[PDB]
Scaffold this active site. Sequence first.
Site, PDB file in Angstrom:
ATOM      1  N   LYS A 169       0.823  -1.197   0.000  1.00  0.00           N
ATOM      2  CA  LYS A 169       0.000   0.000   0.000  1.00  0.00           C
ATOM      3  C   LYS A 169       0.867   1.261   0.000  1.00  0.00           C
ATOM      4  O   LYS A 169       2.096   1.209  -0.005  1.00  0.00           O
ATOM      5  CB  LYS A 169      -0.951   0.007   1.191  1.00  0.00           C
ATOM      6  CG  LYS A 169      -1.867  -1.171   1.262  1.00  0.00           C
ATOM      7  CD  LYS A 169      -2.759  -1.308   0.061  1.00  0.00           C
ATOM      8  CE  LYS A 169      -3.753  -2.394   0.351  1.00  0.00           C
ATOM      9  NZ  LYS A 169      -4.559  -1.980   1.516  1.00  0.00           N
ATOM     10  N   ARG A 176      -4.414  -9.730   4.306  1.00  0.00           N
ATOM     11  CA  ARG A 176      -4.586  -9.837   2.848  1.00  0.00           C
ATOM     12  C   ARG A 176      -3.325  -9.397   2.091  1.00  0.00           C
ATOM     13  O   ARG A 176      -3.004  -8.205   2.059  1.00  0.00           O
ATOM     14  CB  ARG A 176      -5.797  -9.005   2.407  1.00  0.00           C
ATOM     15  CG  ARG A 176      -6.128  -9.043   0.897  1.00  0.00           C
ATOM     16  CD  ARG A 176      -7.113  -7.930   0.477  1.00  0.00           C
ATOM     17  NE  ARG A 176      -7.185  -7.794  -0.978  1.00  0.00           N
ATOM     18  CZ  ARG A 176      -6.676  -6.793  -1.687  1.00  0.00           C
ATOM     19  NH1 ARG A 176      -6.118  -5.745  -1.110  1.00  0.00           N
ATOM     20  NH2 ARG A 176      -6.721  -6.849  -3.015  1.00  0.00           N
TER      21      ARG A 176
END
Lengths: 249, 252
Positions: B198, B232
């Site tokens: 991210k 995840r």
Amino acid sequence: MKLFAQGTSLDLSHPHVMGILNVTNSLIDAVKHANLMINAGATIIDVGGEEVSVEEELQRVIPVVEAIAQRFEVWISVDTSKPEVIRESAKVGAHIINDIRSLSEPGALEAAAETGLPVCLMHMQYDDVFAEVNRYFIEQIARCEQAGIAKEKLLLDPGFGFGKNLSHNYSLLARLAEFHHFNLPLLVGMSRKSMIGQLLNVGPSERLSGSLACAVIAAMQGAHIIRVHDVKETVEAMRVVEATLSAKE
Amino acid sequence: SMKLFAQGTSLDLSHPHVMGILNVTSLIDAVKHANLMINAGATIIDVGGTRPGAAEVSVEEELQRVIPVVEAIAQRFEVWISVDTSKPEVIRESAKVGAHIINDIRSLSEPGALEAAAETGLPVCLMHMQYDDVFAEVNRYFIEQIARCEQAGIAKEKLLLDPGFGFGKNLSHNYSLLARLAEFHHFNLPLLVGMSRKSMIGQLLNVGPSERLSGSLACAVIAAMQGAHIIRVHDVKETVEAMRVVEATLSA
Ligand SMILES: C[C@H](C(=O)O)c1n[nH]c2nc(N)[nH]c(=O)c2c1=O
Ligand SMILES: C[C@H](C(=O)O)c1n[nH]c2nc(N)[nH]c(=O)c2c1=O
């Protein structure tokens, strides 16, 4: 909480990656390697060549400290137990005496006082490994205080590896921040150790991830020095743990 | 102790779990990427056809993409399967085909999604997205959508809670959530987080999308050591390696 050596200072306000420089060509194969790890973001190097004779050891470890002191403003950590090495490394520009044997060798304790440098104590060698290692810290911190090395120059290393099995190892890792009661800095070396090799079942080359995770767990409890082989990766992970513990209040 | 129940099977949320990411954007290639993650430790597979500015797909396109994939897994592996979708058809239809978790990043806010997530007695994952306290804002959001769900058919013992990593949150907002994350256990509800590659790693690193593995592993191990049940990741071999040591310190 700082360290002071050879006129400089080390800020233990954030965690610190120390690389490993086993000096077991040669001298150039050593400065090249430390260059890289400093480029990676290592803030300390751990030089060392260890048994061997005290002349073999000085022969190997002393010139390498010299080149590094007179090429990079990085801190330098000598990994050794012998008193000649302690007093000669200090005379060239070393910052931390790192003794895995914890100053146990004849005259090493006194030589380590003779230098005024920071000295790192590591535990080595009923299933209360935490009591066992705490009381080993409570013992040795006094043994050194009688020797006249101030507690504020004392670094604690629980002793991951060596004679401890899987269980013991991870009980220490779990209760790491409980050693903060000393107000003393905590150095930890777990990289590619068998507590990662047994758990993950991989050759010594590929333990990078189980490694990294041990480095973060340590640091998330406030460990100050982490002693690794893969510095670039550990620095990056250390960047985001600092980002986390800064988000706290 | 927590355990998640769907399709007549369960889920031991006591130890953490690694969720892989199966972007379907063919089907041979999807089942292949499923097997590798399964080999690498993945206890869940998130099937995906959800990125800002990405091509809006149609509901025909979606069911076309995602429904044959969950089918191929359900009959070839024993793994739990999450569907990453926000559309009611895709919910109902994938529930029919052996899907376990509904993963609506838009927290059942589409017309008929809440209802469709009710008609299938499956677990739904709630996700926060979008001055005082970003933890306060997230928490009051879970307080909300936990109720709108309960007033709908579903129970609280079916919900998953997930704060909003990525999705426009800036670097501090992101890293403050990761630091107060265990506080969401007060809900007494499973915690699933996603942080692999991210922007909280992309920014604080000044580094391309490929080479965020070490930063990603770290955010997982911080999240795991605080009690996140599901994590995840794209790089699964590496995450379960890190979770094994997490498991070892949590235990002994
Ligand atoms: C030989 C071994 C290695 O390099 O793997 C080793 N040498 N020196 C060390 N010094 C400290 N303070 N802590 C350690 O863990 C450690 C080691 O593990
Ligand atoms: C990478 C992408 C994005 O941020 O644009 C994205 N897709 N789907 C997701 N589903 C869940 N539960 N959590 C997430 O964080 C997440 C994502 O981040």
